[PDB]
């Protein structure tokens, strides 16, 4: 034996013909990329989310190194944070809960706030209660 | 502003609504179908990957489906109540809606006019496919394999046994009203059940005893309508032909 | 013609009902999934049209759909109520359903019990161009959703549902839910005690149906189960040729070159294609078996949760009393808490009673008798009390009447 | 061309499998309230 | 005439073109069967049920001349029973409800 295969018979082991050790194939890593835009009518900016991807493989993603300027946000920045959705990029987490305006996944939600910038946030379920019971 | 009005009378009516609940259920032989008793054709079916595991098990999913249908709507008393012999509901006439066990299925005597409301005669697949079963003289007459792997398959709840669940639902009703839905049956007059079911709808019980025998009489006749309606021309089970 | 049977006794029952809320979401690629890295057959796939702007937008607003279908499902209240520490309910036992602070999660003991008992290669296929959006609320939120409902429905009962939650004791919540019933409150505060003890031996037995082997979950489970061979079949589809000389785009664009290899690369495009038209079809159709569920969900809970219902097994067999909500996966359950009459006894009825040649009629019971004595009673309990002109209002004259029976109507101001 | 017809029939089926189960359970509702039950619903058990 | 066809255009009925007779055909698959089995962790023993198929004529559809033993004993034996939904066999019926 020389390849092992999947169910979709897609090679996910190989063994290297100069020399006799099992060597695994795994997928290069891959996802959507969604954008998070608070309206054209507010404003341009915009948090752009790379759907269950670490962080650490943004950049290489593209090849922003020999690209426009305007590419380069993504190599460099404060607004880099990594989410249970995926590698949210963009927008700065924030402590403080708020109502959801822009769902995201995993129970963060998104807004537009004030200087200016997009804000990452658990989304609040609601104003805390405590029914005077007795 | 200052002007109101109230009824002195009313009329008991009785409509029929009908329902669809199940379906035929089909099931088809991909293989035989696309490659009848060709093994040439098999073998390049295979090339197409697993499509008809899918349409089987779609299939079949609706196959089951169906008996869970039937079931959910007509099985929801797991007791099999009987109408006592003696027909004394305070003049109320049920004998057109209860079982008759003159005839040899438990069917009553509207469930017949429904049954022979729909008709196969206008289609060929099904038509054929019961005349199959009464044909002796034919030899090997397998008739499973005759229409290219279309097969349909029995209804798991006959319709003898459905309409026992109907005459069980009607002499819990008849006998107790609505506690046999929600608990072990309660036997009471059926006077006073309607007496009850008056009072549900506000107005008071001394209107029903007070004209107890004219509201008997109206039921009765409120029935006999819907035999004209159904036994006539006049064909209302569109909702099941189509 | 005479007969009646009255209880004399009644059971809580905690009957449990489970209904699919939402399925898992999923997204997929054509390029990953038909062309997957390769130029020359994503080159050929866009000369077929929007197809795949079809899938993909299909597949989005489904999954955006199984967001919402949550939202309705669980989202009622925008009040997150707190129960206080002080388990005080009239000996009602709401510890072993309300949330435990005792383990990580925030979730409660019955909920906790759910979330082991449905069984979830399965991240193989995920780097396949197949994608789980992960969702909107996550289940420890979700948990806190129901715990306010619970909150609200113990400490408030059904006001919370129609505007402002007003606090009431749990006692007199259960008092007035048999009112409803058509059960005077004096039942419930006679035997209390009982009552209690009924509910809370009742929700005991639900732990126990639910941590043996009984797996009564099988709609929560197919869920799971029908959406994982949905997956497992459409990956398994990319390894058929469709009638090509192989079943892998990277050999074929190795061993034959563009001009021949286009009739080769198209015969996969089609069948791909054509399976993942399948999956998103039967996707869809789920989807729409889901969403009638979703709003099922909600309907009970807007009805059975938030108030008492009237509508008969609907929430629940027998007279529903109310109902507690519990998050479980994929999924919500209800615990409907039912007044089941139970032991009868024959009792001998007339429609009405003759004293001074007037018909009288019950205010609200029926008149039963046990041998000896005309009696007047509650329908769905038996307290016998004695006839009097305030529980019985005159109608008529006794000749009209069938079935009436002659009796002395005890009249309360004469002595 | 079998195949696709195949399909279809199959795909037609589970879209009228659904409005029959939808019905299904409409009846069974109507069955649960209207018959074992009196239903105070306006026009969902009968005219009046 | 010297073919007939159904529905379907397909062949049904045919005439022998040596003594002009009348002849039909009566095409033999049986793909039409179901297996009736609780869980393998239980038991194996296994009933077969065949839909909407005589219990008589079971042995000519399945062409016993070019089967297993294994299938043979599904063909004949005490445990077999007929039923409105077709033939049962490895299935004892009972009386009881
Ligand atoms: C590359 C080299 O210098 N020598 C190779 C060795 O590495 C390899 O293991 C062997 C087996 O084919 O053949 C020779
Ligand atoms: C889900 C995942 O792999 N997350 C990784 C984590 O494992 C790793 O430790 C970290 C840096 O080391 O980057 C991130
Ligand atoms: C700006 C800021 O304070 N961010 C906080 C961080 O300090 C804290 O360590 C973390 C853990 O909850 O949560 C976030
Ligand atoms: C609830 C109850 O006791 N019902 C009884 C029934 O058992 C008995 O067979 C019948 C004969 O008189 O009378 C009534
Ligand atoms: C249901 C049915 O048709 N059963 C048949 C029976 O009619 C026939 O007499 C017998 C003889 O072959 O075979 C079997
Ligand atoms: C073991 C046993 O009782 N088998 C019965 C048989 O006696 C009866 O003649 C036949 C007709 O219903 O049904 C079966
Ligand atoms: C009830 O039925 C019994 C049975 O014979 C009869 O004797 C009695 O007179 C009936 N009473 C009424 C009120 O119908
Ligand atoms: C079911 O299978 C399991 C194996 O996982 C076995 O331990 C158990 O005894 C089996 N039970 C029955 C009733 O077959």
Same mark, same amino acid.
């Given at each position: ?25 795994t ?24 759907q ?42 924030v ?36 029914v005077?019971?007795? | ?48 990957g ?23 709507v ?79 398959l ?81 064909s ?7 | 013609?005479?007969?009646?049977? &009255?209880?004399?006794?009644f ?7 489970? =209904? ?6 999923t ?30 937008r ?14 309705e ?18 000996? !009602? ?13 925030? +979730?409660?003991? &019955? ?18 161009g197949?994608?789980?959006?992960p ?18 429905? &113990? ?9 402002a ?12 839910? !048999? ?35 009984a797996?009564? =979950? ?12 949905? =997956? ?15 079943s ?19 015969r ?17 159709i789920?989807?729409?078996?889901? +969403? ?41 359950? !209800? ?19 003759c ?7 019950? +205010? ?14 509650? +329908? ?36």
């Open positions: 034996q020389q390849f092992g295969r999947d169910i979709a018979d897609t090679t996910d082991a190989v063994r290297d013909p100069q020399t006799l050790e099992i060597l695994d194939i997928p290069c890593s891959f996802g959507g990329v969604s954008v998070i835009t608070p309206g054209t009518n507010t404003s341009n900016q915009v948090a752009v989310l790379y269950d991807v670490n962080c650490t493989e943004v950049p290489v993603a593209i090849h922003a190194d020999q690209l426009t300027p305007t590419w380069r946000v993504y190599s460099t920045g404060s607004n880099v944070f990594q989410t249970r959705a995926g590698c949210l990029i963009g927008a700065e987490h402590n403080n809960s708020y109502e959801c305006d822009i769902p995201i996944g995993a129970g963060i939600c998104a807004s537009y706030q004030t200087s200016q910038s997009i804000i990452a946030y658990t989304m609040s379920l609601g104003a805390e209660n405590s005077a019971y007795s | 502003n200052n002007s109101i009005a109230i009824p002195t009378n009313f009329t008991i009516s009785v409509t029929t609504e009908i329902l669809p609940v199940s379906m035929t259920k089909t099931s088809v032989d991909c293989t035989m179908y696309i490659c009848g008793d060709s093994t040439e054709c098999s073998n390049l079916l295979l090339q197409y697993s499509f008809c595991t899918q349409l089987n098990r779609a299939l079949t999913g609706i196959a089951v489906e169906q008996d869970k249908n039937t079931q959910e007509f099985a929801q008393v797991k007791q099999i109540y009987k109408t006592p012999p003696i027909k004394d509901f305070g003049g109320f006439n049920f004998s057109q809606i209860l079982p008759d066990p003159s005839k040899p299925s438990k069917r009553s005597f509207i469930e017949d006019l429904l049954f022979n409301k729909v008709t196969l005669a206008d289609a060929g697949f099904i038509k054929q496919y019961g005349d199959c079963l009464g044909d002796i003289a034919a030899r090997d007459l397998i008739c499973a394999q005759k229409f290219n792997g279309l097969t349909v029995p209804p798991l709840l006959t319709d003898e046994m459905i309409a026992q669940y109907t005459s069980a639902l009607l002499a819990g009703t008849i006998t107790s009203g609505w506690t046999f839905g929600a608990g072990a049956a309660l036997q009471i007059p059926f006077a006073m059940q309607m007496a009850y079911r008056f009072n549900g709808i506000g107005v008071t019980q001394n209107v029903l005893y007070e004209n107890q025998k004219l509201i008997a009489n109206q039921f009765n006749s409120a029935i006999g309508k819907i035999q004209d309606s159904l036994s006539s021309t006049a209302a089970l569109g909702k099941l032909q189509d | 013609n005479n007969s009646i049977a &009255i209880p004399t006794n059971t809580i029952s905690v009957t449990t009902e489970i =209904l699919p809320v939402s399925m898992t979401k997204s997929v690629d054509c390029t990953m999934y038909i062309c997957g890295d390769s130029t020359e057959c994503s080159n050929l796939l866009l000369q077929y049209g929007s197809f795949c702007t079809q899938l993909n299909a597949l989005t607003g489904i999954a955006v759909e199984q967001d919402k279908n949550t939202q499902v669980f989202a009622q209240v925008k009040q997150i109520y707190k129960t206080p520490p002080i388990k005080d309910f009239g000996g !009602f036992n709401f510890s072993q359903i309300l949330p435990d602070p005792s383990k990580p999660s925030k +979730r409660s003991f &019955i909920e906790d019990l759910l979330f082991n008992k449905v069984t979830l290669l399965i991240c193989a296929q995920k780097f396949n197949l994608t789980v959006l969702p909107l609320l996550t289940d420890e939120m979700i948990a806190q959703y129901t715990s306010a409902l619970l909150a609200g429905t &113990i400490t408030s009962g059904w006001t919370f549902g129609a505007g939650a007003l606090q009431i004791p749990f006692a007199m919540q259960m008092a007035y839910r !048999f009112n409803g019933i058509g059960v005077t409150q004096n039942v419930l505060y006679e035997n209390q005690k009982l009552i209690a003890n009924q509910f809370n031996s009742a929700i005991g037995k639900i732990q126990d149906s639910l941590s043996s082997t797996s009564a =979950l099988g709609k929560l489970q197919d869920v799971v189960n029908q959406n994982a061979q949905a =997956l497992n079949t459409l990956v398994k589809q990319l390894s058929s040729n469709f009638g090509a000389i192989s892998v785009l990277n050999d074929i664009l190795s061993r034959l070159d563009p001009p021949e290899a286009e009739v080769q690369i198209d996969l495009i089609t069948g791909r294609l054509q399976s993942l038209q399948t999956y998103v079809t039967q996707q869809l789920r989807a729409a078996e889901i +969403r009638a569920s979703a709003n099922l969900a909600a309907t009970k809970m807007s009805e059975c949760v938030l108030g008492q219902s009237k509508r008969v097994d609907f929430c629940g067999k027998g007279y529903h009393l109310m109902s507690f909500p519990q998050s479980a996966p994929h999924g919500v359950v !209800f615990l409907h808490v039912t007044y089941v009459p139970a032991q009868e006894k024959n009792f001998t009825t007339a429609p009405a009673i004293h001074d040649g007037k018909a009288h009629f019950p +205010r609200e019971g029926v008149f039963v008798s046990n041998g000896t004595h005309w009696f007047v009673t509650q +329908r769905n309990f038996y307290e016998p009390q004695i006839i009097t002109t305030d529980n019985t209002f005159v109608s008529g004259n006794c000749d009209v009447v069938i079935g009436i029976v002659n009796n002395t109507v005890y009249d309360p101001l004469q002595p």
